Amino acid sequence: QCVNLRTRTQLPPAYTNSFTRGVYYPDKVFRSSVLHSTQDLFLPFFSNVTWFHNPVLPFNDGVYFASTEKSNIIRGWIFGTTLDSKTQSLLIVNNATNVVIKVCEFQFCNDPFLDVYESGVYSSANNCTFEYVSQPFLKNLREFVFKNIDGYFKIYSKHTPINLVRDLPQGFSALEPLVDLPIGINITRFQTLLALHRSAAAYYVGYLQPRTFLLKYNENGTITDAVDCALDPLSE
Amino acid sequence: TKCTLKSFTVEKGIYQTSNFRVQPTESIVRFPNITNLCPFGEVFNATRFASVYAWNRKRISNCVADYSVLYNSASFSTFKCYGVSPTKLNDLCFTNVYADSFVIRGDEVRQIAPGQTGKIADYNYKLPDDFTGCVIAWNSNNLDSKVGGNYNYRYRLFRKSNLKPFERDISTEIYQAGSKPCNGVEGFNCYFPLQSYGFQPTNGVGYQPYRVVVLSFELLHAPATVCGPKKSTNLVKNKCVNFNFNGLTGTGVLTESNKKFLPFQQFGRDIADTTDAVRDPQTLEILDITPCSFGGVSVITPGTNTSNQVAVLYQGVNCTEVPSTGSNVFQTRAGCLIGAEHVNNSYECDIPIGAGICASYQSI
């Protein structure tokens, strides 16, 4: 039921400044009114991230994803190495009622999309190993961080009400952990899924690098400010 | 004091001898309400088991398996474990489980075992000699055997080769022992590999049907998922005890605290990596940890020549847990002092004690 479209929905690959977004709680420890220095994977400050207004993108160490969501156009993600039943494949879809996570060897069409009149982007599904159902994830800003370390898939998320027109705001907001999954995959690429009816989506992508950060914990244990040590000499 | 000073005579003064510490009382464990039991009911209490050469396979992963109920269950005539002893099976576990269910005769029960050979063990299913796990066999003559003959069950009897480990053969190809090919019709040199069982309610012991389930455990590099429950006991308060809260092991006294954990933190620490607050997986409340008291001890003596009575001071210890009683006990900003009486007067300082007070000999 999946075929390629007529025209090419080549979204413009623009560039934009990261500013001070992409900070998450690295663990589940509670600290009150203290400055803590840590070393982990982070999105560097004031980096350039890619803006899409739907190709294959490498996974690398981790992924930071952002969406200026308007009326819930984006639907889910696909992860894998060769993107076929010859290898493993992870599918995550947030439909109208719940979120579904599947670990199987799918046979996806060239240009998947959910479509409306459930899942039909895959021609076959065999040897399914892991299944998961939970509460749905979703003029809003949706920020997600995906990491895959030692056979563990970590998803952090945050939702923000924003009023700015085009780009990311000049603000700070930590990302709370959302999901941990005990599944061993060696993902290298990922995609994006749209609910396209037969008849232009803006989002931002950035990568993660290992470095050291300084974080400030207030009285209640909420991160309010951070400093990137590998920057201009004043920060160091 | 004589021991520490290595002398038989001691002059007037205060000397530090040893230390004091409060021992833990009892131990506690704490784990969540636990759930997601493995669905073993549909395996052993299944309606009907398939054929021996078409044995059913069940994959068990991401659940908790209570082995105590099956270990104590006497409904199974044969329970042979080859991997590890079943008693400790509840603790050690593996990343995934395979359950192999079929039906054999009462005389074929010993075919299913590591390092065993036979018709079932070589033509219907193969158990590797390095197999790890357990085999559970139980009589089912009242159900599987039929009065008219249980010909529904079939077993493979003829095959050119044996079975590989963890291999299921359901092929119905006409076996040809001889050199004469057959065009799909059984002949002198051609026979059907599968023979029907003839179970009866009254057929004698050893020929009755027996349902066999083999549990095999595998430990691929993926994290382990399925094994026994984590028992937890009740908790106590205001007593120096040792605890293992969800893997965090330590000793101290547990009190109630008003700190506000944000809904995803588990435990907290202040500085220098020292845990202070924890959250119990069952009640979900914030508890505070304090190291139960300790401190040095000291002896005040007026000299060996004068007398031979002394006073004992515990430094930085509240006057609540000395043991014992001795004489009147006085609480000072420096600790707790026993063996001397407090007076209202004020003289020169003989044997310094601390916080602006000191003692002397008169009684002390």
Next chain:
Amino acid sequence: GNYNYRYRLFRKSNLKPFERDISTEIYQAGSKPCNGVEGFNCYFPLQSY
């Protein structure tokens, strides 16, 4: 055939160093106590050569 030599096979707990234990008792392999009766889940710890 030499059968005068026997070796232990089952014991409640591991032996202490330089400890010689000679008493022989039935072993309760299963949950059901043998009560001094040899049978199911009960085997003699001494095996011959």
